[PDB]
C-alpha cells in the first residue's frame, strides 16, 4: 500500500483557480465541534491513496 | 500574477502631495501565485 | 504575432515595456523587433476597388 499520495477529501469551500492550500486545519463534519481534536464526525482533511 | 507599476517624479512640496498628472509605467510581472490579503510595509 | 503589411522605419518612440502598438481596430500598427530593439511601422499594403 503506497500511501505517499494524499488528496483533500474534506474542505469547507471551493478553491479559486491556481490555488494551493497546505493548511493543516481539521474539518467539522458533524454538529459536534471538533476544536482541533479528532473524535466523532471529525476526520483528517487529507486522505491517503491506497 | 503580481504586477508592479512605478513612476519617479521630482517634487519639492514639503508636506503633502502635489497636484498634477503623471502616469505609472509597469516594471515587473512577478509570478508568485500565492494568496495575499494583508500586507505590511517597512 | 503573424500578419501582412509594409514594414517601414518608425518615428514613434516606444517605452521599454511596450512591445507592439495597436490601432482602433486592435491590429498591430507598430511593432518592436524582438532581436533588434527598433520600432517598425506596419502600413497595410495597398488595397482598392477595381
Ligand atoms: C539578441 O537579442 C537581444 C534582445 O533580447 C539583443 O539585445 C542582442 O543584441 C541580440 N544578439 C544578437 C547576437 O543578435
UniProtKB/Swiss-Prot annotation, chain A:
Output the superkingdom of the source species.
Viruses
**Outcome of swapping residue 7 to F:** In strain: B.1.1.298
Q: What is this protein called?
A: Spike protein S1
Q: Where is this region: Immunodominant HLA epitope recognized by the CD8+?
A: 2-10
This protein's encoding gene: S
Q: Which residues of the full protein are shown?
A: 447 to 496 of 1273
Annotated effect of mutating residue 47 to N: Reduced host ACE2-binding affinity in vitro
Spell out the residue ranges making up region: Disordered.
9-44
Disulphide linkage map? 34-42
Amino acid at each position: 500500500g503506497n500511501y505517499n499520495y494524499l488528496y483533500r477529501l474534506f474542505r469547507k469551500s471551493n478553491l479559486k483557480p491556481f490555488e494551493r492550500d497546505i493548511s493543516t486545519e481539521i474539518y467539522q463534519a458533524g454538529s459536534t465541534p471538533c476544536n482541533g481534536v479528532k473524535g466523532f464526525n471529525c476526520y483528517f482533511p487529507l486522505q491517503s491513496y491506497g | 500574477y503580481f504586477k508592479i507599476y512605478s513612476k519617479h517624479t521630482p517634487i519639492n512640496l514639503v508636506r503633502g502631495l502635489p497636484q498634477g498628472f503623471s502616469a505609472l509605467e509597469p516594471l515587473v510581472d512577478l509570478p508568485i501565485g500565492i494568496n495575499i490579503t494583508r500586507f505590511q510595509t517597512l | 504575432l503573424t500578419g501582412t503589411g509594409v514594414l517601414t522605419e518608425s518615428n514613434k518612440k516606444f517605452l521599454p515595456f511596450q512591445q507592439f502598438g495597436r490601432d482602433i481596430a486592435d491590429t498591430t500598427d507598430a511593432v518592436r523587433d524582438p532581436q533588434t530593439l527598433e520600432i517598425l511601422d506596419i502600413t497595410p499594403c495597398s488595397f482598392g476597388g477595381v
